Amino acid sequence: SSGSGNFMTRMTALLATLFFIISLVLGNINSN
Amino acid sequence: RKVYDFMRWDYWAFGISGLLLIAAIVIMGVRGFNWGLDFTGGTVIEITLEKPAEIDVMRDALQKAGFEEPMLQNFGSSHDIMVRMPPAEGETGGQVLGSQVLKVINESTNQNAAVKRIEFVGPSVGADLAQTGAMALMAALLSILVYVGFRFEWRLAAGVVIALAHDVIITLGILSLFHIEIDLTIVASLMSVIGYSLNDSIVVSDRIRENFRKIRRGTPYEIFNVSLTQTLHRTLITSGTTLMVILMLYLFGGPVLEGFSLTMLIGVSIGTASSIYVASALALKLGMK
Amino acid sequence: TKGKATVAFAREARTEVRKVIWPTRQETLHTTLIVAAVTAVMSLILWGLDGILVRLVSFITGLRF
Amino acid sequence: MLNRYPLWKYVMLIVVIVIGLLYALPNAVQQNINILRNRVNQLGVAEPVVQRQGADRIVVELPGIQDTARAKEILGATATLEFRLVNTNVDQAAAASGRVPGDSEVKQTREGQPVVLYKRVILTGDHITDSTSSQDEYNQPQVNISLDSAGGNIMSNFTKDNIGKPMATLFVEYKDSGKKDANGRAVLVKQEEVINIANIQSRLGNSFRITGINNPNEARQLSLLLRAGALIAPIQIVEERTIGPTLGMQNIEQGLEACLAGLLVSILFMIIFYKKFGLIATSALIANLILIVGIMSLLPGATLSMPGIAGIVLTLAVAVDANVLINERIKEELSNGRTVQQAIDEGYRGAFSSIFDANITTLIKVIILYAVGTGAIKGFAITTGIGVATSMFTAIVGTRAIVNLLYGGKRVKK
Amino acid sequence: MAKQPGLDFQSAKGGLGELKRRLLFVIGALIVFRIGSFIPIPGIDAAVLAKLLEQQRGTIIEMFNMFSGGALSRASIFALGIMPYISASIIIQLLTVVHPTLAEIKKEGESGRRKISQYTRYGTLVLAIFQSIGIATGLPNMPGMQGLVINPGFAFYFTAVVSLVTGTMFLMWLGEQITERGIGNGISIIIFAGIVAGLPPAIAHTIEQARQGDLHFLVLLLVAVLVFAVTFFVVFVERGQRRIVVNYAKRQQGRRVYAAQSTHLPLKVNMAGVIPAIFASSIILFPATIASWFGGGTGWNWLTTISLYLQPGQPLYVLLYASAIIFFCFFYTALVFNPRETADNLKKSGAFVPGIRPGEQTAKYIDKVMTRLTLVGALYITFICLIPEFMRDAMKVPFYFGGTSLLIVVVVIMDFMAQVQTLMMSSQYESALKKANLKGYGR
Amino acid sequence: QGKLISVKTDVLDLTINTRGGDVEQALLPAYPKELNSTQPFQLLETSPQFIYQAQSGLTGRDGPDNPANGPRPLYNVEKDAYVLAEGQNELQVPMTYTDAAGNTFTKTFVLKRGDYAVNVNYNVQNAGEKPLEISSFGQLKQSITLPPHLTFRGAAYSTPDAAYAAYAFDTIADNENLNISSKGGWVAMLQQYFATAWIPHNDGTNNFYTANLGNGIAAIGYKSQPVLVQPGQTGAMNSTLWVGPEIQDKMAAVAPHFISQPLFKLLKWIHSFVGNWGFSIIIITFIVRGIMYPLTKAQYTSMAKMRMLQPKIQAMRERLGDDKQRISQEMMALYKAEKVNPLGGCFPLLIQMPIFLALYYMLMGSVELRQAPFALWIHDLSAQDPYYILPILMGVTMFFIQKMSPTTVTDPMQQKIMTFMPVIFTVFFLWFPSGLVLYYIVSNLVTIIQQQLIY
């Protein structure tokens, strides 16, 4: 990690990290 | 963890940044600063327009209402264009019945557009809003100045209001050049931000007063310096929280709240930029006889 | 520098590698089965794991894209 | 204890905040939203991505636009499905063909071409049962429409005459209002968009051929839109995206959203820059907000405004930074050699002095602004005033567990 | 340029809580990459296949492929791959070799010299942006259609660009989140996550989406049934290892205390030669990949003077790699890089001598290869790892790319397969030494 | 390679390249190129730094003149110069090539007295005696702009069944590719007074196309319906090549009957009705640069003071292998003052880039650097000739804005990130107009008033 400290919590980090598939891809949730 | 390097470079750097403050006030005089709807009266139209869409069509309807080409003062962000021009003449005001010249917004074949709002404030009415705006603004700053003087120290109160106002007046002169309206929302924003930035000044100054009262035969001015280096990171962390709030405001206010957000965004950012440290060093010069 | 100069290394290496090869057989079927087994399983372990995640999400993108 | 709220009180506060976040905030049609999505364009729409807010409820209206309640059925209007022989000379330009390199509303508005001939009704009314794309033997993917038996039978009978004629798949077209006396209320003409143009050559009546497509691998979205256009019965648009119609009222909502999101990320700061444990560090903020919403409903005497909401940012601000002022005080002084033995009592005596000063510094501006300002400033300082008096006492007493929380554990340098 | 905070580990502590995240962090990183390396990017064109005409659509090129973990077939949210990490890796380790006296990194007469911890992970996040516009605005006729990455509306390509750079934010986070109950550090963790986009179907995945429903056929999935050539090459790497796994791990032969059975893992002997090899290949594979990645050409790949000397560069640049190896392995590896970790934390199988006996390990098994993995001489090591790269890349491979990427992830598979064995025991009770040296050896 | 031959008549002066067999220079003997001169006006040109020409021929997969090849073939012509005069109305110049299987292709430029239209008659002799499918073809290819030496310029297409369309050479930053199928028609290039066009007389459907053929070279053409030619048969396809006066009705009398707009326009909207061109761009740049008042300095000072010796720069990597449950406290513990610079991290790098690239993009393709704005002191913002002040001035201005507290050192890492900037800038921006260069000076002018006195 970095030497200046801060915490990215892991559940929220995984959920944000695999959001992009279920959101801004077209056809999947909404077809345009 | 200990050891900070920047202090002699910084007050000198503040010093060259000074000429950018000279410049900002010169834009204020040369290009003007007084413009608004609340501020002195104004006629305002806001429209959403698609980029390749014909603006000469948009100009044809404002021509027909009777607004002229130097008088139309252009602003725009993202997908919205915002045009502002002096108070509407005679009995032909901004909300008038009839004519039907601006009602052609929202039908298209190339000028792809939509009307959002239309505004009108008249001149002597706008004037009371601006003069009270101008007083309201000044009295709150003055009032804070006086508190920091009585509370702590006047040499530091004056060094604070000098330092935190300098990046405000520099940022304002950029806005001045751009013909931004200085509505009561700009007044509210200028008096929103002073404190979330100055809270950082408050902690250092509390510590400096406290460190000064305990000491016995030693000197004040050495302990002032240490008081900075002790409370340094705290000032950086401090108002990180308010900055998170203003950024959320900035994301969902988008174009129509952009300069209100931009004054807030820059406003919370001045406590750690010009800051207490330059302010303290000038009051330190002054204290030292 | 670092061109066609600095001996003695490349030719020596080639005779070194040929002679580490030399005194022993290079292959054996069951020892090949064990290394392929760990290799296979490790590929299978991944494949079951993204079978219940991305393989289901991509079924929709087959269907609707 | 490290927590300075009694246990049933702490539960009771925890009950209170989780029960409270249910309040106010809570609120085939959905496959025909692509077709409905092309009708929203022409109004300045930078990014026309369409979305449902329920099963039969579709949300996409623009930022800030004057009244759309006049436009609901105009915008919801369907085609007759009349399909009749035309002639497209030379270009072979058509609206869904134009959408393949991606689409843009002025490029789409100017999309399409003159028709030199434009007469002779072949198919009319309901007549489509499907549309789909299939790879075919032309190297470039082919889109097909599947026609009904009665329609098929009509096409089958008139095949040999029409074989080689251009035949129009026809959906609604816009049209200038007659009166021109107001914004956004001009009725649509139901059969004058050439969406796709293609030539009869099928020897199978129930199968109609639509021009092949240059999409790099994609084709289902384009495939669906033709049967979406045909099988749609009217959809009247609803709800908003935070952004949404009426500019000055939209400001209020998109600022109120901003104080909720602003709040939420301020908590993420707390989580991100400090050590988690219980709900202790979050606790005085949630009680301050509640008293703020409480005092205001006991006093419904004003009116809402965005200067109010800016006071709401201002009063949020004092609440978030005051929590930060007490957290960073205790550790840093503990780190710099301030007592351990006498800690909590000296944190009572010195840890709250900048919490006071900020709140006082905040109050005197608000007071001076209320007296001398006009318009927005009154709006702004009123909502703030209650909140600044409220926050100060909430914090001075309510942030006191913080001092025990961060004098606990390893006495090593923080 | 730079910033320091904001990419960083979860909050944690001891005592009787949080016991169930056993191999969750170690191997979840690999699954996390697989979701974002298979899926399409945001937009109307994002399942993008390469051109069959002049004016439109991109082109396949091996340089994009081997460092992406992708290929045209789709354009994916993590489709920067390992390319900015390895490219930082060349800038902040292989370009500093100049002038030994101010070079640093070398041995001092003094103890220690560590300073580079923060450079690779944050170096990735300067190149990611420039790379992300480079492929998005690269290839002869774009990747797919026409999106430009500064659009405040029609912003799909910008949206893929943001998704890549915030994805590199997240891929970096994955490397250093292991510390709560996982294992591995440094480069190895990232590579094990990063090239893991293929293997099973032979190809670099997307049997997914493409063979789903009423879809007829996609021509590229012709080569996918050929998993035996793919596994044949990955075996052929394994094959060259000395084969030794022998006897029992009971009592005093254990490399686990209290075992009954012994882990059926050969002790790998060729692991050391891979350290110089990757750095020798990646500095030659970088300027051609740059020109491939920011590639262009009118209707087809640019074949003018300069770009002819880079773009079909392959076969000559690999020969230059096979020659140049000697200068990473002679006067540089062991003076930069650490000679530690020969076989003591890699061997988890039992038996200290084969046959369990005093002295007499033999030349034919492990003894004489053991001497030159330690005592002065570094002739053997790097060369034996060029024979599998040559076999695989002289005939190519049904993975959609050859090259040294398909040396690196195979070796980190052996490395983790040893590590996972004693991980509950090491998490339970202290293990004296954890990997971070890799066997760095040359002359 | 190949040679140039001269072909002369009363209104027509043509010059024919053996390489490809094409007319790559043409002149008009009846219109001098200035007052009291004997020099004709130049029409087609092909010398370095500009191309304008027709390319004649037959295409398809065995077809010689196809525009997807490497170098066009070396046609034979019997003569080194041709002059037309009394006794014959018509001069015929056959350019002759035989491809490897033994077919004879001939493209014959035929020129009559008193006319600007040159008939082109394409023949294949099928002497290698197997099947051929061969397609009639033309390209017309033109540079974007012509510097003086001694816009109206563009392309046009017409069909007999639709409206004429045309498009000028002031907005190519990309281009259309044109997929038009039509029988009859013609394809043209336009200029002041003059034009060239291909008028294919061929039966059946023609395929038209337009293209870029490299940076600021535009092209337009046709490919006619494949002609089936039998073993031992001679076949024929027919076109007229116009080289003279811009009369669009003439050709139909002769004939058989990426970049987009959103950021660029958005930056247009913040000053739309001003109407002072170059002046608005440099003002809105000062403003945007003033929004960037911490940000521009934040970019600067993150390439400045990058290291803090050995002890400070190493952090939270060796400590992870330990596994010991304190590591979360230790992270928070480590740097307090310390702010070490490891190259990137996205944020003082990303934000600034799209507005100044949109400003680059607008100014590069501009139509608005043509007039001088009244308020500006400089005229001639589209000037890009060698031997002028503004590019040295910008080289020195780039250098100045990296100065003032740089703090040098002789470390290998990161130092020359500062100092490579004016080196890359000065050589790269030394080509293309004064108004591009002048924008970087007003962009840098915000940093400058924080450097020294200036008005």
Residue numbers in the entry:
A (entry chain G): 509 to 540
B (entry chain F): 14 to 302
C (entry chain E): 444 to 508
D (entry chain D): 1 to 27, 226 to 612
E (entry chain Y): 1 to 443
F (entry chain C): 57 to 206, 217 to 323, 335 to 532
What is the paper's account of this structure, in its own sentences?
The hetero-trimeric Sec protein-conducting channel translocates integral inner membrane proteins and secretory proteins into or across the membrane. The SecYEG core-translocon forms a central pore through which hydrophilic polypeptides are transported, otherwise closed by a girdle of hydrophobic residues and a short helix (plug)8. YidC is required to facilitate this passage from the lateral gate and for the subsequent folding and assembly of inner membrane-proteins and complexes. The ancillary sub-complex comprising SecD and SecF stimulates protein translocation through SecYEG8 assisted by the transmembrane proton-motive force (PMF).
Subsequently, cryo-EM 2D class-averages were aligned against the RCT reconstruction to generate a cryo-EM volume. 3D maximum likelihood refinement using 53,648 particles yielded a low-resolution (14 Å) structure (‘gold-standard’ method and Fourier shell correlation (FSC) criterion 0.14322, Supplementary Fig. S4c,d) with dimensions of 11.4 nm × 10.6 nm × 9.2 nm. Therefore, we placed an E. coli homology model of SecYEG and the E. coli YidC structure as rigid bodies into the respective EM density of the HTL. A homology model of the SecDF sub-complex was placed as a rigid body into the remaining density, with the exception of the SecD P1-domain. Best fit of P1 was achieved independently from the transmembrane part and the SecF periplasmic domain (P4), by rotation of ~120°. The quasi-atomic model corresponding to 75% of HTL was flexibly-fitted into the map employing the molecular dynamics flexible-fitting method and NAMD2.10, coupling the Cα-chain to the map. Importantly, in the HTL the three periplasmic domains of SecD, SecF and YidC adopt a ring-like arrangement, wherein the SecD P1-head and YidC P1 are positioned at the exit site of the SecY translocation channel. Close-by the SecY lateral gate, density attributed to the conserved TM domain of YidC extends to YidC P1-domain. In the inner membrane leaflet, towards the cytoplasmic face of the HTL, there is an inter-connecting density between YidC and SecY, highlighting an interaction. The horseshoe-shape arrangement of the TM-domains of the HTL encloses the central cavity within the protein complex, which is occupied by phospholipids as evidenced by our SANS analyses. We propose that it provides an adaptable, protected environment for membrane-protein insertion, folding and controlled release into the inner membrane.
